[PDB]
Amino acid sequence: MQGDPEVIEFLNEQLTAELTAINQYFLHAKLQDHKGWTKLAKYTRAESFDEMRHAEVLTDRILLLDGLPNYQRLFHVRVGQSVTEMFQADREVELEAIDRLRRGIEVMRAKHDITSANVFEAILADEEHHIDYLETQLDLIEKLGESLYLSTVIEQT
Amino acid sequence: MQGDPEVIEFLNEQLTAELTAINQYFLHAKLQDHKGWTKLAKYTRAESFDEMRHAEVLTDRILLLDGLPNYQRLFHVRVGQSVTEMFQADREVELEAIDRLRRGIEVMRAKHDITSANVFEAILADEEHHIDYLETQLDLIEKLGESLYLSTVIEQT
Amino acid sequence: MQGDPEVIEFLNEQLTAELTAINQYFLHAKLQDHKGWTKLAKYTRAESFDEMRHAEVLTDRILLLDGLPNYQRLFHVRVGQSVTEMFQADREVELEAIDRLRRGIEVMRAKHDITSANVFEAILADEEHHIDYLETQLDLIEKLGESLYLSTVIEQT
Amino acid sequence: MQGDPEVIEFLNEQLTAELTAINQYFLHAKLQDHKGWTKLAKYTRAESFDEMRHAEVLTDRILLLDGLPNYQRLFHVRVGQSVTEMFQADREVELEAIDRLRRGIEVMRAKHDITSANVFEAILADEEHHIDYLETQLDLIEKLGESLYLSTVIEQT
Amino acid sequence: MQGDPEVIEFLNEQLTAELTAINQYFLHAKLQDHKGWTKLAKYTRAESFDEMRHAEVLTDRILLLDGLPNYQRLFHVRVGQSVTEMFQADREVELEAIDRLRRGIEVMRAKHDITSANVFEAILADEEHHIDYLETQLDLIEKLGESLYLSTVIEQT
Amino acid sequence: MQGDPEVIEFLNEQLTAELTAINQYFLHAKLQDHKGWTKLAKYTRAESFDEMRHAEVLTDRILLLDGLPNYQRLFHVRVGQSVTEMFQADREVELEAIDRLRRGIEVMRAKHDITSANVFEAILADEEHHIDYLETQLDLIEKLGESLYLSTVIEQTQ
Amino acid sequence: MQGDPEVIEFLNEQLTAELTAINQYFLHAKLQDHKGWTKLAKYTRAESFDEMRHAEVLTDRILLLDGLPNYQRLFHVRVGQSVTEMFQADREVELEAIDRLRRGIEVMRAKHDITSANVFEAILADEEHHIDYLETQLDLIEKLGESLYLSTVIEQT
Ligand code: HEM
Ligand code: HEM
Ligand code: HEM
Ligand SMILES: [Fe+2]
Ligand SMILES: [Fe+2]
Ligand SMILES: [Fe+2]
Ligand SMILES: [Fe+2]
Ligand SMILES: [Fe+2]
Ligand SMILES: [Fe+2]
Ligand SMILES: [Fe+2]
Ligand SMILES: [Fe+3]
Ligand SMILES: [Fe+3]
Ligand SMILES: [Fe+3]
Ligand SMILES: [Fe+3]
Ligand SMILES: [Fe+3]
Numbered sequence A, B, C, D, E, G: 001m002q003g004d005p006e007v008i009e010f011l012n013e014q015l016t017a018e019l020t021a022i023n024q025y026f027l028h029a030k031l032q033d034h035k036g037w038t039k040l041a042k043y044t045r046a047e048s049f050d051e052m053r054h055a056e057v058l059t060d061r062i063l064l065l066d067g068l069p070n071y072q073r074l075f076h077v078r079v080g081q082s083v084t085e086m087f088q089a090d091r092e093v094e095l096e097a098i099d100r101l102r103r104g105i106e107v108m109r110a111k112h113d114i115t116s117a118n119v120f121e122a123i124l125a126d127e128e129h130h131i132d133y134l135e136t137q138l139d140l141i142e143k144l145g146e147s148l149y150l151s152t153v154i155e156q157t
Numbered sequence F: 001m002q003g004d005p006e007v008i009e010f011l012n013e014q015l016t017a018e019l020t021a022i023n024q025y026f027l028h029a030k031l032q033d034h035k036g037w038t039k040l041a042k043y044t045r046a047e048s049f050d051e052m053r054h055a056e057v058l059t060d061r062i063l064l065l066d067g068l069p070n071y072q073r074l075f076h077v078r079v080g081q082s083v084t085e086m087f088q089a090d091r092e093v094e095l096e097a098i099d100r101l102r103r104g105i106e107v108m109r110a111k112h113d114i115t116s117a118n119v120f121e122a123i124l125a126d127e128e129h130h131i132d133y134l135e136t137q138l139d140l141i142e143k144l145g146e147s148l149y150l151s152t153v154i155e156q157t158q
């Protein structure tokens, strides 16, 4: 079994996006922990681990179709200074991923490849959940404020 | 055993009120949880299940008297945007229920039907407790403020 | 993320149907229990709880797309008096739901919204299972009879 | 609920294929165990049991649509002498099944029947996994050789 | 307290090397597992996890000195086809790391920074042990033969 | 075995610094606990115990080289009234210690004494960690505000 | 919710009576224990604790109606010398309480306040039980005698 070139192209582009997300989420988690915002750091670390799981699934699927995964290419990694900036950078990454996933699902399903489409469907569900969380947190920061919001995630130990 | 039409009318009106309360409380709990106010959402959910218990008891009593419960009629369901508005809507519902319960208890007890009166007495006690809680929370919001009050009911997960 | 008006319209119509089903099933369970048919009552109660879970899932999906769930609507609620009539009313409700679900799945999937389509697919599977059970029970009643069928669900304890 | 004749035709053809696979896999497992290749025999038995699970699911789906499962006809059952021949026969069976499954999924989904399509999708995923395993084993036999490969799957007991 | 630019430059170069090693080792583990060589795959996976332990330690040290870790650039990632090529690629990576670590330890210790020197000393010990293992495995492949060597790392289930 | 006079001089100076740190940290912990800031008090108590362990290790090393530990000296002990002032005093103490430790490590290692150098290396790592924590807390106080910062370390208990 | 002034007046008078009873019962228990009548002392202590619980319930009810509990006023506290005098003093207190409770229940129930009436009903039941016990003990003392009755409650451990 060999897949079409286009399906493998879509899978490789998604894999590159997943690797970039892993790097960005880890850097942000370390930066947050360094400043004393422990409760945010735990969540960001967990999200990075989720990105690793997605990347492994994509690699498995690519290999099963007699392809060569791309572990050399990266996109642009965004680094933030405030907390609002970190949230906005994550939002940008997630939106790009969602659009790509929808287009890929359509194209793959149009060529009689169902397992790849199901892989993207699961990834799409997870991405939508994460983007929902990010938007909620941005709304909370807007309502409360930087200092009053930050006083609830700092811990003494 | 066949009760008077008026006692069944009172019981059916109370049942309609309880169903409307179930709807409103569950919707409010979902809306609060969506925004990140977790500790409020737990309490609102518990209140909705109390509405469970009240409605089921009323249905049992109506059926025992050879009547037909009304599961088709609803009152007006109020939806709030802030937190103060949600509290005020709940307050309105509770006050209406309390007045109806008192009038019904008098009328029923005047016709030699004691079990129905006891049912309303228990429901009345519970409603008074809930209205007390709501008024206390409104006072707290007034004293502290919206932002400072809201910072105490938000978690990360 | 904001969905199309039509997807939200489909979701709201399904939510109204779910609420109507909850009411009808719970009333039927209470009516059956009052008459001494115990095992039927247990089964009907479980089915009503299933409908409750479906409604909660629909509400979550509607809220995630920046919509307003409709908790004020209600279709016509059918009430039966013998076992055959109860089974037939449930059958009518289920058939309507299945047709609506199929049409909605097509329309949603044609607009690049996959998660909503998956929600309806799961709901459709459950509806088909329930309709199968109802048809089997109607066949059994026809073969055995009302009295000989009812003697097997009556318990005394 | 009655399905279209074509969907039932597809399901019955898949059921016949599943029964033929059960027979072939179990015969191969017995033949391998007779010769002293124990670790191969365990795997082959497990695969035959999986084919049974698939057949039972297909029968359930066919019955739910008011159809008559076909438990009478069989395809051609292939028997091998070496180990390479057994692997090649299994490969042929799997490839035929995969092509049929893809065509059927398209046709079914084009007629507004989703549950049948999901059944075929799950079966397709499992078939692809098994074909992957078979191709890997054939590559290993080619690289090492038949004697050196066979020395690793024999025990005394 | 902020360190010299040169110490941070050394730390950042080592961090880039560690990230490249993580990528290469994980890809090699997946490739080996796909072919049926199981114990090799387990060992390679463990090595990749070790490489990330090193990367996290380096990031912590860089952040403590008021620096900016570099999570953007990568070196050249080598991909092999047979076991010998994979082992040789790993050997090349390890040798480069060893040379860099020795030079960095000298330079850092000459400027009165001891904790950074200790970090590199630990990393250097680990790298030397890994390179020892790789050379031993290459010797074994040369002696036994590549088919007779591969027959000992292939398993069935 | 008899060490050089200079190595013992370095060790004795470090021991005096450790004793001064013990005193200052314990006093600060008591002052913080008296005012109702509980979690700060727990952290400061733990830090004082760490300084005690460091002092014991230094005494052991000095005795092994046929020397006489100095348990009579004391530097100036700083006492603060706010929370910012307490953090700043601790910062001053830590910076002095770090500079002394680096100079001592160089000098000792230049005379073929390795165990003493390793002792100072461990102490230096711990000092750097503590100074990092102090700087982070000062940044947090600057950002949040001192009242909004203090509201998060008070408790009823009892 | 604000109650009528008269209901609050009744509740406050009952609260004053409860506080006076607490004081008298505890003093009597201490006096009895000092003389060596241990088995009487245990019972008197338990009764004082019961009065404490009643007072707490009354305070809660008064506060829920937006009133001010009266913790400053006391009635006349009676102190006895022999056991008969202690029993008679307790009897007097209980009789006064019972009469007041009956009058209050009537008045409150005539103004559509039901929860307060239920509170007094529970308190009235408890008072009647205690007065029954006291009368029985006085009858026993009359039949047996002071010395023969006292010899059965004195213990030495
Ligand atoms: C099931 C698959 C995987 C698992 C269970 C896993 C597990 C872990 C663990 C335990 C850590 C250490 C966490 C820490 O240091 O705080 C980690 C970090 C890391 N892993 Fe993954 N990993 C997986 C896949 C991958 C893949 C595929 C890559 C790269 C292609 C990768 C790259 C990294 C990196 C760069 C870090 C550290 C960066 C940071 O500090 O956030 N991992 N992972
Ligand atoms: C006569 C009508 C209804 C009755 C008798 C009823 C009854 C109940 C009962 C007994 C429970 C379990 C109690 C608990 O665990 O707290 C429950 C929970 C639940 N109810 Fe209802 N209900 C009714 C209407 C509704 C409506 C209108 C909704 C939503 C629109 C709904 C959605 C739910 C959900 C989702 C749960 C699970 C709680 C959760 O997941 O958080 N039910 N209901
Ligand atoms: C609950 C555990 C301990 C308590 C309550 C305790 C009690 C104390 C206190 C309160 C002080 C200093 C008080 C002050 O200076 O104002 C002290 C001095 C000291 N402690 Fe502890 N101690 C404990 C454990 C230890 C341990 C485990 C060690 C060593 C492993 C240790 C070694 C020392 C030393 C060396 C000094 C004096 C050093 C100097 O003054 O230069 N202590 N003891
Ligand atoms: Fe992802
Ligand atoms: Fe309530
Ligand atoms: Fe449903
Ligand atoms: Fe199969
Ligand atoms: Fe390594
Ligand atoms: Fe120290
Ligand atoms: Fe009392
Ligand atoms: Fe994501
Ligand atoms: Fe109620
Ligand atoms: Fe259902
Ligand atoms: Fe199979
Ligand atoms: Fe490394």
Ligand SMILES: [Fe+3]
Binding pocket: F047, F050, F051, F126, F127, F130
């Ligand atoms: Fe320290």
Ligand SMILES: [Fe+3]
Binding pocket: G047, G050, G051, G126, G127, G130
């Ligand atoms: Fe009493």
